[PDB]
Coordinates of C-alpha atoms and ligand atoms in Angstrom, one line a residue:
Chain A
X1 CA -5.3 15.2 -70.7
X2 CA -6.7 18.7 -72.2
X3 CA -9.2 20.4 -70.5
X4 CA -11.2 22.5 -72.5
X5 CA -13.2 25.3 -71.2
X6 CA -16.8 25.8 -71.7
X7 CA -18.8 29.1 -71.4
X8 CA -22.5 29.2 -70.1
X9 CA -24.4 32.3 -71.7
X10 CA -28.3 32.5 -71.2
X11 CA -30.3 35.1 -73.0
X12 CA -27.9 33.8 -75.9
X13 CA -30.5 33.7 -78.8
X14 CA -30.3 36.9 -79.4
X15 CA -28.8 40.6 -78.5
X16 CA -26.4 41.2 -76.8
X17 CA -26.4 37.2 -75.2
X18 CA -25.7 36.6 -79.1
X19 CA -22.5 38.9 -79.6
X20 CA -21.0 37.5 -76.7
X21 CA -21.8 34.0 -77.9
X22 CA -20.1 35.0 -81.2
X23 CA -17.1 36.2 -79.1
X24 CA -16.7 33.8 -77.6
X25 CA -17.1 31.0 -80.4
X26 CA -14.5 32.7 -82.4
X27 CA -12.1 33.2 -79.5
X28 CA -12.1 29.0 -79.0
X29 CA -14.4 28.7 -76.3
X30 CA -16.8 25.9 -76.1
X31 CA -20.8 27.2 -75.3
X32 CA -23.9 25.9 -74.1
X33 CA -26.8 28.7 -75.1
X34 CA -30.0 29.3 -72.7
X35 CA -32.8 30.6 -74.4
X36 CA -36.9 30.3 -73.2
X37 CA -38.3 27.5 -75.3
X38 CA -38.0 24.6 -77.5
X39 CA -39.1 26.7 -80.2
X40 CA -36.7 29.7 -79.6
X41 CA -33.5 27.4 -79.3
X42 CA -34.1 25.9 -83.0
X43 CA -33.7 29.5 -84.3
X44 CA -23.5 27.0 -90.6
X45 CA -20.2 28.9 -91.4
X46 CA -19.4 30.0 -88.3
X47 CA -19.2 26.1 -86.9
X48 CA -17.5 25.5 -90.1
X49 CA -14.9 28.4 -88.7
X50 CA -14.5 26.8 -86.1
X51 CA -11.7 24.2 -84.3
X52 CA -12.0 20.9 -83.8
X53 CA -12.6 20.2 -80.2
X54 CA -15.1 22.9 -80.1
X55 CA -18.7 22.1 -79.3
X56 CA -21.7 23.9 -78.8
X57 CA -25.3 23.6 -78.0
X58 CA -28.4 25.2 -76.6
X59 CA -30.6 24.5 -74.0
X60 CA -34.1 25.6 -73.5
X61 CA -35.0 27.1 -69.9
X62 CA -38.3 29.2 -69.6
X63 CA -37.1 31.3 -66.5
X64 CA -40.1 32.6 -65.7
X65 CA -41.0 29.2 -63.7
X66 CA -38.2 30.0 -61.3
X67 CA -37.8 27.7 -58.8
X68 CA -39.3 25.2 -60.5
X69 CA -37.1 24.7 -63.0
X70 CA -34.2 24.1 -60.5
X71 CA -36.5 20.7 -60.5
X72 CA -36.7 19.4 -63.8
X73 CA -36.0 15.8 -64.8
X74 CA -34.1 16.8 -67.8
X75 CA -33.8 19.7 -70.2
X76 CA -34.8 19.9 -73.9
X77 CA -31.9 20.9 -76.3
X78 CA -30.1 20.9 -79.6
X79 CA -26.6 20.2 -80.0
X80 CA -24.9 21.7 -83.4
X81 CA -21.7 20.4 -85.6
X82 CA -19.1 21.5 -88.6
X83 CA -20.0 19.1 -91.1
X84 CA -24.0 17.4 -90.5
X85 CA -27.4 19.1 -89.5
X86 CA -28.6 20.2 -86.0
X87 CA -29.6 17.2 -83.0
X88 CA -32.2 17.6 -80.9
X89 CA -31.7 16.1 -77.4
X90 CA -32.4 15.7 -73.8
X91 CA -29.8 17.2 -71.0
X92 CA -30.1 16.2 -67.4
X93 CA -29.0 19.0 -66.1
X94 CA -27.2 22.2 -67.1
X95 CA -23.6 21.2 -67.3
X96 CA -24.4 17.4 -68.6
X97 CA -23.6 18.3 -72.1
X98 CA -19.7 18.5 -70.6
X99 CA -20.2 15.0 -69.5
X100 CA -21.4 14.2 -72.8
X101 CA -18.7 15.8 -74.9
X102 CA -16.1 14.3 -72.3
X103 CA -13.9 11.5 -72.9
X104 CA -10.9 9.7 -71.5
X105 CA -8.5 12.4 -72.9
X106 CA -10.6 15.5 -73.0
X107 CA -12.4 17.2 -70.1
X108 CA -15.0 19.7 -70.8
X109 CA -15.8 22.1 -68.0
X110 CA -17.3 25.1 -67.7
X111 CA -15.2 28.0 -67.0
X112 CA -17.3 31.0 -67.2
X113 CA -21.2 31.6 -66.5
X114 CA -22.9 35.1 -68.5
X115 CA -26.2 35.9 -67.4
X116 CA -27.4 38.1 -70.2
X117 CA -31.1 36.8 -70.2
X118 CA -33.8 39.4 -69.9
X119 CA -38.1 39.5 -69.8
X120 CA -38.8 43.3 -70.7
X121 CA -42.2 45.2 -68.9
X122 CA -43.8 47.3 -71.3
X123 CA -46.7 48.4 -68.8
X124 CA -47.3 51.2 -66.5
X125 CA -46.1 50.1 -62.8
X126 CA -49.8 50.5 -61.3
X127 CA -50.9 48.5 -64.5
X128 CA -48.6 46.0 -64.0
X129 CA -50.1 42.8 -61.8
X130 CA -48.8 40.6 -59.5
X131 CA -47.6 37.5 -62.2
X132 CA -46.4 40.1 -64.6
X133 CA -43.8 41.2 -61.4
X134 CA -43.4 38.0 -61.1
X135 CA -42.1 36.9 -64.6
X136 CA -40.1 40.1 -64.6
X137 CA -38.4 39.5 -61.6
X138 CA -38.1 35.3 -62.1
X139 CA -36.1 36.1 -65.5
X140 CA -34.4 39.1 -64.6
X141 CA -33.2 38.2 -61.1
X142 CA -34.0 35.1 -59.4
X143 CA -33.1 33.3 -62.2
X144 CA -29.6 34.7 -62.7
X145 CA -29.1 34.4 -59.3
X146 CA -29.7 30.6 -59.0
X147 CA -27.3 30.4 -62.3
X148 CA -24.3 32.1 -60.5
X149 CA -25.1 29.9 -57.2
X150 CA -25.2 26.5 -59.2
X151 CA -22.2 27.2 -61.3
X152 CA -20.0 28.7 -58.4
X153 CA -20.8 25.0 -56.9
X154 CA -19.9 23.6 -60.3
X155 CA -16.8 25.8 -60.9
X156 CA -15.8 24.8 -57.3
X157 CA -16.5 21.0 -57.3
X158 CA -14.9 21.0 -60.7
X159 CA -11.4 21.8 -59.1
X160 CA -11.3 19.1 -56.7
X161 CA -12.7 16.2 -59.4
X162 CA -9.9 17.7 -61.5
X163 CA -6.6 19.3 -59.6
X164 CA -4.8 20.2 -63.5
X165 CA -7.3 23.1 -63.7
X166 CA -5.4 24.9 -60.8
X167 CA -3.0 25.2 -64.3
X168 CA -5.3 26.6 -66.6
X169 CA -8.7 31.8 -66.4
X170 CA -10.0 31.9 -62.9
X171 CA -13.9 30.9 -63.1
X172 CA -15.5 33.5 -63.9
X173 CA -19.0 35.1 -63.8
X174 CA -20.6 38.0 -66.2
X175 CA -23.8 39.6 -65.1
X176 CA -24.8 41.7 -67.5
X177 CA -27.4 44.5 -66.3
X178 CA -28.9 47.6 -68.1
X179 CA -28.0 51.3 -68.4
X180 CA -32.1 51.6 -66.8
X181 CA -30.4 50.3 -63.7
X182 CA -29.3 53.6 -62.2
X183 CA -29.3 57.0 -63.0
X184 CA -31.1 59.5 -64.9
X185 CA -32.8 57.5 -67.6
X186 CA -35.9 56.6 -66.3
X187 CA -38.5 55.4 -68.5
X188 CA -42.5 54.8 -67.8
X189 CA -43.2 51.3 -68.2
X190 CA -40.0 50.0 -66.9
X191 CA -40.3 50.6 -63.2
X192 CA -40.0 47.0 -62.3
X193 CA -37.7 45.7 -65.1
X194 CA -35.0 49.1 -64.3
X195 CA -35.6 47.5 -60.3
X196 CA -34.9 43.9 -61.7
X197 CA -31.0 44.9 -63.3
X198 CA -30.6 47.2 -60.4
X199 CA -31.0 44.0 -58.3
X200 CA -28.7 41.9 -60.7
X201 CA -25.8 44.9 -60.8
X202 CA -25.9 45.1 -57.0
X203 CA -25.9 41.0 -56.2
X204 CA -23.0 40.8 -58.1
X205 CA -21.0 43.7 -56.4
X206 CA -21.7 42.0 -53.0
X207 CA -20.9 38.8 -54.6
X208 CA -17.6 39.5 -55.4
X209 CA -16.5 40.7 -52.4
X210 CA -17.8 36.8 -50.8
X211 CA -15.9 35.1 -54.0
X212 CA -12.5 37.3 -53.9
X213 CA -11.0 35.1 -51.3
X214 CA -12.5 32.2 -53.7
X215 CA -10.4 33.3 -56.7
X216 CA -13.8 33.2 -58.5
X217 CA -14.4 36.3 -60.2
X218 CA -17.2 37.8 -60.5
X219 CA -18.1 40.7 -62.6
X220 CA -21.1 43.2 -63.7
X221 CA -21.4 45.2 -67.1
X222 CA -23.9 47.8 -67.9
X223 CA -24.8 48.5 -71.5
X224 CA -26.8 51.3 -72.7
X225 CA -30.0 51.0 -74.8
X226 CA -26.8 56.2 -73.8
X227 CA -26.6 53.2 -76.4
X228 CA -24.3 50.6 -76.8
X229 CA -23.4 48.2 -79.2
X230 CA -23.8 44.3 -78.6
X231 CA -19.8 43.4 -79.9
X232 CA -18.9 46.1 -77.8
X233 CA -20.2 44.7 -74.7
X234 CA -18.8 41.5 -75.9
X235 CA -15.6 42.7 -76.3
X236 CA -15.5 44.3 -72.7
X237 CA -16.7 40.2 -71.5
X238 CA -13.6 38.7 -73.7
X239 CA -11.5 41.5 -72.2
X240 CA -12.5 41.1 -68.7
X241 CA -12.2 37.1 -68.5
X242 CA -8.9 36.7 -70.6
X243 CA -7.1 40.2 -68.4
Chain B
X1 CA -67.4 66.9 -43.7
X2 CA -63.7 66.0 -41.9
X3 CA -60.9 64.9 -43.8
X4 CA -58.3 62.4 -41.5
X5 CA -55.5 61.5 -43.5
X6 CA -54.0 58.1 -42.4
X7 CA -50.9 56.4 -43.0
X8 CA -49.7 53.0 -43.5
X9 CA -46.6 51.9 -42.6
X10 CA -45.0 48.3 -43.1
X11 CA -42.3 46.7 -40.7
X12 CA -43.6 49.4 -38.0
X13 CA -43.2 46.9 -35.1
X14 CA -39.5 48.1 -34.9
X15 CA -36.6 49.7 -36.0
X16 CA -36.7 52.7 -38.7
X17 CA -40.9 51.2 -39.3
X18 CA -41.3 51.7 -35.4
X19 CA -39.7 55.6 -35.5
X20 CA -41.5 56.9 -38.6
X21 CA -44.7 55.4 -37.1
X22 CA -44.2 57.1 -33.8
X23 CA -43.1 60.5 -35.3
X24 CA -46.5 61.0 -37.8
X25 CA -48.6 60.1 -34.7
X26 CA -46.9 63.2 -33.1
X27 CA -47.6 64.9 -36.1
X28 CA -51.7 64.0 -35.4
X29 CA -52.2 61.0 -38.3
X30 CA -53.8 58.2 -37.8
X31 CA -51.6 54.7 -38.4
X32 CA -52.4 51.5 -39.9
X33 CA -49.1 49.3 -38.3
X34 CA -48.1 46.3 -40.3
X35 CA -46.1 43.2 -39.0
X36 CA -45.3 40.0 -40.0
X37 CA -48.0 38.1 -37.3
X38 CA -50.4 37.8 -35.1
X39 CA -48.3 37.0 -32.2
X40 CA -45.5 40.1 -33.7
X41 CA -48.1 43.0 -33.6
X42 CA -49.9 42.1 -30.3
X43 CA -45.9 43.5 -29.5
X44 CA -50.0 53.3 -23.2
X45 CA -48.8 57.1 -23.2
X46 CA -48.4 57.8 -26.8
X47 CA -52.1 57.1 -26.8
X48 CA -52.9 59.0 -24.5
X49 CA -51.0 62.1 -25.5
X50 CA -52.5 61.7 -29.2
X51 CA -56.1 64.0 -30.3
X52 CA -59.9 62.7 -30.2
X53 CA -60.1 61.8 -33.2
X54 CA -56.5 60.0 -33.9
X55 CA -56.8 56.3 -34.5
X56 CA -54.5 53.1 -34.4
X57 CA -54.1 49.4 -35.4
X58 CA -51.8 47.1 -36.6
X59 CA -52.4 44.4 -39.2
X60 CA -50.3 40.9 -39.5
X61 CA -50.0 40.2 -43.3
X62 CA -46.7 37.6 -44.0
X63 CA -45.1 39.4 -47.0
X64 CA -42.9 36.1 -47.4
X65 CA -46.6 34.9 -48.9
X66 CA -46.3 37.1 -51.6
X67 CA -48.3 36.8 -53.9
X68 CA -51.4 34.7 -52.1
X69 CA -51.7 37.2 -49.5
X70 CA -53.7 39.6 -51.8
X71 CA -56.2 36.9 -51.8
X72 CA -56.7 36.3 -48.1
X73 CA -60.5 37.1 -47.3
X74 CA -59.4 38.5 -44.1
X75 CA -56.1 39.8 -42.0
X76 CA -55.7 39.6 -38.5
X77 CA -55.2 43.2 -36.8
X78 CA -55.8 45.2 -33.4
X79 CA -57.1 48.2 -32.9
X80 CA -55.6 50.3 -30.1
X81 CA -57.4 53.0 -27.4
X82 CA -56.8 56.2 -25.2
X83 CA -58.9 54.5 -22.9
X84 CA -59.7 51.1 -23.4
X85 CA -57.5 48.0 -23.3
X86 CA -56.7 46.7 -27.5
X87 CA -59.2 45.1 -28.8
X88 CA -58.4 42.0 -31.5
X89 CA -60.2 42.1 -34.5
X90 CA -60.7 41.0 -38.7
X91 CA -60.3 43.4 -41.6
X92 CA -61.0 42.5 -44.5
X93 CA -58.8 45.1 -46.6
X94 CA -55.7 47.2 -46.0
X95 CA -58.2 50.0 -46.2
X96 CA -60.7 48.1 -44.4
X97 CA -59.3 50.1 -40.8
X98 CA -60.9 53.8 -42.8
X99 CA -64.1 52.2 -43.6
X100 CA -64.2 51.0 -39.7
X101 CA -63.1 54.7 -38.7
X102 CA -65.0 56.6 -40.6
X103 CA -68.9 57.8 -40.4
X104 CA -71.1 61.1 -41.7
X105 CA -69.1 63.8 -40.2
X106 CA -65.6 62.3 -40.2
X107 CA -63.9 60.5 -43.6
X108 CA -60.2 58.4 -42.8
X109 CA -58.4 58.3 -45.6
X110 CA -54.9 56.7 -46.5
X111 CA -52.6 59.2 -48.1
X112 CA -49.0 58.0 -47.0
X113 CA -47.4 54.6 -47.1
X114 CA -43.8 54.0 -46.1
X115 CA -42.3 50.8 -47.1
X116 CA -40.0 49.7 -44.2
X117 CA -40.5 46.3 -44.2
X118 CA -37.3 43.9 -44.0
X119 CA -35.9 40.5 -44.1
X120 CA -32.4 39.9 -43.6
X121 CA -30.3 37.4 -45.3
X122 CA -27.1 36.0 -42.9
X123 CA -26.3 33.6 -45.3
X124 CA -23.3 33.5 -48.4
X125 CA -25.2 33.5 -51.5
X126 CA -23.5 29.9 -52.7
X127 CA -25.8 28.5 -49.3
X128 CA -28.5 30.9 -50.0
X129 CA -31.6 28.4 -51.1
X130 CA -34.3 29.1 -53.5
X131 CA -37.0 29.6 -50.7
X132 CA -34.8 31.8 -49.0
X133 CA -34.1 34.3 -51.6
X134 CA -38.1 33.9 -52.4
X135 CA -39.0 35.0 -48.7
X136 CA -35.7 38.3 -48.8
X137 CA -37.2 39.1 -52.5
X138 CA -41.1 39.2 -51.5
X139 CA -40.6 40.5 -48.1
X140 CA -38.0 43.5 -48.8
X141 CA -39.5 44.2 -53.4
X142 CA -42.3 42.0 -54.5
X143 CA -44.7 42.8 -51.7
X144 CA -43.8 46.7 -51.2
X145 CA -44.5 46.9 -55.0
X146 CA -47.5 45.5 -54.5
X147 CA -48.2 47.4 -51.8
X148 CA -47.3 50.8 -53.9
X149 CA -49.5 49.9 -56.4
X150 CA -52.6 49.3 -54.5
X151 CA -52.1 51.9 -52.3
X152 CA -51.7 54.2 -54.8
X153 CA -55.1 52.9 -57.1
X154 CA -57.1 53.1 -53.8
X155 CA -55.5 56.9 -53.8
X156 CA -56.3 57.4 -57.3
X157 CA -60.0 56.0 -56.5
X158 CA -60.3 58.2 -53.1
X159 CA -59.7 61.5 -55.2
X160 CA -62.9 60.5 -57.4
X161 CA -64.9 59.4 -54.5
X162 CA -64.1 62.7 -52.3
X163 CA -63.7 65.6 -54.2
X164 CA -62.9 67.7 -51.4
X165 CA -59.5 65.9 -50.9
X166 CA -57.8 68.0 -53.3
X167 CA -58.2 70.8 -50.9
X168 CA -55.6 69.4 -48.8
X169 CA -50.0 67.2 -48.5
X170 CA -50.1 65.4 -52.0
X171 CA -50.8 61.3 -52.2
X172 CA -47.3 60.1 -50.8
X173 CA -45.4 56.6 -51.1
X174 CA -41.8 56.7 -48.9
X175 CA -39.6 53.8 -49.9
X176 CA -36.8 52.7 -47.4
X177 CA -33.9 51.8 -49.2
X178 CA -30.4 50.7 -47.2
X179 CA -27.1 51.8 -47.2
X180 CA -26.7 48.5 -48.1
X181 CA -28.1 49.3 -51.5
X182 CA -25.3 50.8 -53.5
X183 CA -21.2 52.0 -52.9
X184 CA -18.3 50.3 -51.0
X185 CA -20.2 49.0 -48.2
X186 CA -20.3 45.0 -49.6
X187 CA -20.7 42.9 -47.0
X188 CA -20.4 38.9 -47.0
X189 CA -23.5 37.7 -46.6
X190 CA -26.0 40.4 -47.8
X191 CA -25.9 40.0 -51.9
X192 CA -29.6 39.3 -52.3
X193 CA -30.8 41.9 -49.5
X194 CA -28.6 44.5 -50.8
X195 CA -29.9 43.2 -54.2
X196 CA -33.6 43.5 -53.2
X197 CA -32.8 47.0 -51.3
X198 CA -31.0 47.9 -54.7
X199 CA -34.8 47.1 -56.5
X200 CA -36.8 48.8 -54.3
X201 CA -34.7 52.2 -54.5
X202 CA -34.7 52.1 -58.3
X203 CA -38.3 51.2 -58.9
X204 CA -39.3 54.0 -56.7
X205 CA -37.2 56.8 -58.9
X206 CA -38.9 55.4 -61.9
X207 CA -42.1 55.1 -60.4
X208 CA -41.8 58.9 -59.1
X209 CA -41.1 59.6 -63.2
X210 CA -44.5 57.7 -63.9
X211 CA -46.5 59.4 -60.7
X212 CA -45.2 63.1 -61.7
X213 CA -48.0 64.4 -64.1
X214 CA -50.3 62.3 -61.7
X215 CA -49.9 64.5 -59.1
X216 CA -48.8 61.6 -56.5
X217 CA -45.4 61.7 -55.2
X218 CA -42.5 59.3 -54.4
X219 CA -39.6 58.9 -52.2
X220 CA -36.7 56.8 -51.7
X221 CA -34.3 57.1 -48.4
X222 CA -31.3 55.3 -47.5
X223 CA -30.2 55.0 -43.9
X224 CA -27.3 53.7 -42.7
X225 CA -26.5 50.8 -40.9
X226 CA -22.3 54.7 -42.1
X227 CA -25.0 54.6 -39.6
X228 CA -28.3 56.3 -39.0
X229 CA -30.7 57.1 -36.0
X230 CA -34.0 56.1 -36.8
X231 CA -35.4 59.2 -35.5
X232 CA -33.6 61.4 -38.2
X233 CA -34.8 59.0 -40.6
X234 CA -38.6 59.7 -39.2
X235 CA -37.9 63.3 -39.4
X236 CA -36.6 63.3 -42.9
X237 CA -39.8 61.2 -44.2
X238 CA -41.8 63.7 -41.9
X239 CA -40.3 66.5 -43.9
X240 CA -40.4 65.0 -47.5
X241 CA -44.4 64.2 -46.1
X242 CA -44.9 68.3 -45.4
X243 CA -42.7 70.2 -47.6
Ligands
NAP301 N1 -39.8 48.0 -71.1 C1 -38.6 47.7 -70.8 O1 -38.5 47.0 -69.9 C2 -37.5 48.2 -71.7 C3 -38.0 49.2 -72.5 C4 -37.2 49.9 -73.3 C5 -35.9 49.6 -73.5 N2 -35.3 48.6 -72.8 C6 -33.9 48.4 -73.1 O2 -33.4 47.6 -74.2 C7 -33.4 46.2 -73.9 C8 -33.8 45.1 -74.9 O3 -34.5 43.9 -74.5 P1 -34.7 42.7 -75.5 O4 -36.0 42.0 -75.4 O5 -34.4 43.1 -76.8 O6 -33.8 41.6 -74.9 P2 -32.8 40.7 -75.7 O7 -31.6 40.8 -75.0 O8 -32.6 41.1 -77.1 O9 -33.4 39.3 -75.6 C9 -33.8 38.7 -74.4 C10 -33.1 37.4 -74.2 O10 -33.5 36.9 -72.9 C11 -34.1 35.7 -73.1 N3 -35.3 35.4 -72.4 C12 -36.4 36.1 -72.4 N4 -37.3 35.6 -71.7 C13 -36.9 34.5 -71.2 C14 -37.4 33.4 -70.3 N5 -38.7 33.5 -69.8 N6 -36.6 32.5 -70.0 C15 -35.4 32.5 -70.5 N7 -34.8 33.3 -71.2 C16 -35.5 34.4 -71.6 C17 -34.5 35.6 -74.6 O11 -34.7 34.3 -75.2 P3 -35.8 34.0 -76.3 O12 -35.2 34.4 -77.5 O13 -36.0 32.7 -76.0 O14 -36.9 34.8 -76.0 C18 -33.4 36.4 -75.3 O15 -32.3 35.6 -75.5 C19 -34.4 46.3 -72.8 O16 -34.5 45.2 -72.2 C20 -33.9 47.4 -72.0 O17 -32.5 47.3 -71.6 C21 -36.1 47.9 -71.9
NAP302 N1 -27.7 40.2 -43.4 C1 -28.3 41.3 -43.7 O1 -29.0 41.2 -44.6 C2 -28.0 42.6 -43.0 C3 -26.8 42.3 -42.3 C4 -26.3 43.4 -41.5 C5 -26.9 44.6 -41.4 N2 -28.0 44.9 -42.0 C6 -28.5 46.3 -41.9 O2 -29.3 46.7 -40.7 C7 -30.7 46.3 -41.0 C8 -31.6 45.8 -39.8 O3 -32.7 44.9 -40.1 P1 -33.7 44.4 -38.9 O4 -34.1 43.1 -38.9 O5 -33.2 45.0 -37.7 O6 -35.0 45.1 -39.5 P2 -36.0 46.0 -38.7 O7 -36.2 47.1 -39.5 O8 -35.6 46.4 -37.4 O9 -37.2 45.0 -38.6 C9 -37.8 44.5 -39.8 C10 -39.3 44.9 -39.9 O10 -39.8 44.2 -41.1 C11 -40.8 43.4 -40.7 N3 -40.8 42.1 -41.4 C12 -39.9 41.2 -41.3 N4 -40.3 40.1 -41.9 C13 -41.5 40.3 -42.4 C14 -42.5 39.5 -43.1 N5 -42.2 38.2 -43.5 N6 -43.6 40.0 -43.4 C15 -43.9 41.3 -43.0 N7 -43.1 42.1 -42.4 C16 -41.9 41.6 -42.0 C17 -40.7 43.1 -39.2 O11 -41.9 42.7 -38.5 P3 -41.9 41.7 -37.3 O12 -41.5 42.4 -36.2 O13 -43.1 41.2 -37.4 O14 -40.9 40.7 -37.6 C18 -40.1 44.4 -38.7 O15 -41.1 45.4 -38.4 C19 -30.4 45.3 -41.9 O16 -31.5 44.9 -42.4 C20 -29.5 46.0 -42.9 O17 -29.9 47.3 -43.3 C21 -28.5 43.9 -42.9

């Protein structure tokens, strides 16, 4: 039986959720991309590239309807191959498509969770209304948050259905926050989204220290706008889950 | 034509709230006391030892109902005496308590709010629900940024409407962070109120950037759980109030 890990990367459209896609693609990883919408998830020779086993697909969650979404019958997305065009489907939940790449020889799990998603503010904080706080926040935070929770249960539940993987990475989880979140870059117009990533970077610090006893990992990253370059940041994710 | 400046403070039934309330009523300003209920804020010589003209209530506003209560037509409150027993009443407004105060001669006006306000979390983030990060999230960020913003509109507006008022301390907003916010302290079962504490403190440094050339000013303090009396804390914000 192989078991072949999968990554979870949200915010993966684009950016800097993109690079680290790309990362980890070439570096044999299986991935399931988040982005907002049916649109945005329909966007060849870097499947082509790739090896045989590996899948990938992307599902489409608008986090700004956080919780709700935690309620959904079944999620639109599009699963993508070497040699014929793009398929559009329906997942049940987040980590179905490893149930439907599974067989009775290989086990697709996911291994590793990167919360890269991100809603930008644009307006001045006393400009800025109640909803608009709210998307901000529901993208930026709440949603993330939910992620790690749901795939810390997954990670975990996955050991027990499958006692091999005790073989194999720890599970791992990649928050990645913003250079806005501290310090003394502070720009007007991003009051609540700088609050949002300071949020994210802190959860996970905490978080850690609850999942070291665990052996889940769980790590936070924060890239500039100074600046910093989207394979860089992907190199530090690839370097941190494979150390 | 008198100018009483007021302040409102949030979570002032106790703790830090409770000290900073009890130190600017020393310091002769009138208080508009939040809590979480009606039954929390109905909770002699402080009264008593306060000047003629120095008022008091306390208003129950539920922050975990963020955002529908900025649409309640009405908050419970009481209004409290030198010598008179408290006397239960409606306001229809935050600011609703300086419209009640005021007449000709005398004109109550906010021009301080501390954010103290908190919900604690006791739980590990993997059996943290959805409705309980909603009610840490909108009790200890979503609500005080609310609260920041229309306090500091109403500020704005009270400047147009009373041009005397720039005869007198500057608008003021205090923020009360946690130690829990940033550093080494990380303890199990505080990721998403060390996250929302972690908000709070950021949006009020970049909010302060925003507020600069408006001539409003903004402040973030941590306390401690290492540890800090909630009287220094009250003398700090007293001094940050009047410097
Ligand atoms: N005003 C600000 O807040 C601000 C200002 C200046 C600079 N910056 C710095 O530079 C950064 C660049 O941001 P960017 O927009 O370019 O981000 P990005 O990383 O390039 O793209 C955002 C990602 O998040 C996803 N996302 C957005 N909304 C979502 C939703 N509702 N549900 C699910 N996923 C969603 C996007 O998917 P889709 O493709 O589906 O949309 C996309 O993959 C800023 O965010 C900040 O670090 C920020
Ligand atoms: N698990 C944790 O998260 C944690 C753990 C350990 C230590 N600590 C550290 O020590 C701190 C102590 O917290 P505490 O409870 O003692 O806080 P507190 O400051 O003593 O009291 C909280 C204040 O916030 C108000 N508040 C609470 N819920 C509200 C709501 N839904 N709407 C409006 N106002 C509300 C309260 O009003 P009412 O009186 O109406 O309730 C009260 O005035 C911790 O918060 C943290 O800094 C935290």
């Amino acid at each position: 039986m192989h078991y072949l890990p999968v990554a979870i990367v949200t915010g993966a459209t684009r950016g800097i959720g993109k690079a680290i896609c790309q990362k980890l693609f070439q570096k044999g990883l299986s991935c399931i991309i988040l982005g907002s919408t049916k649109e945005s998830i329909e966007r060849r020779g870097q499947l082509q590239s790739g090896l045989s086993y590996q899948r990938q697909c992307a599902i489409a969650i608008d986090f700004k309807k956080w919780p709700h979404w935690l309620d959904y019958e079944s999620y639109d997305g599009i699963e993508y191959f070497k040699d014929r065009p793009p398929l559009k489907q329906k997942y049940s939940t987040l980590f179905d498509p490893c149930n439907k790449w599974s067989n009775n020889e290989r086990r697709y799990y996911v291994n590793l969770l990167i919360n890269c998603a991100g809603l930008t503010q644009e307006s001045l904080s006393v400009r800025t209304t109640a909803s608009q706080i709210q998307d901000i926040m529901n993208v930026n935070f709440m949603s993330p948050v939910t992620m790690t929770n749901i795939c810390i249960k997954y990670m975990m539940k996955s050991q027990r259905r499958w006692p091999e993987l005790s073989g194999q990475a720890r599970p791992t989880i990649v928050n990645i926050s913003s250079i806005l979140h501290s310090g003394k870059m502070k720009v007007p117009g991003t009051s609540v989204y700088s609050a949002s990533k300071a949020a994210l970077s802190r959860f996970t610090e905490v978080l850690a220290a609850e999942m070291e006893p665990r052996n889940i990992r769980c790590f936070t990253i924060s890239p500039g706008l100074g600046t910093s370059a989207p394979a860089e940041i992907a190199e530090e994710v690839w370097s941190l889950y494979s150390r």
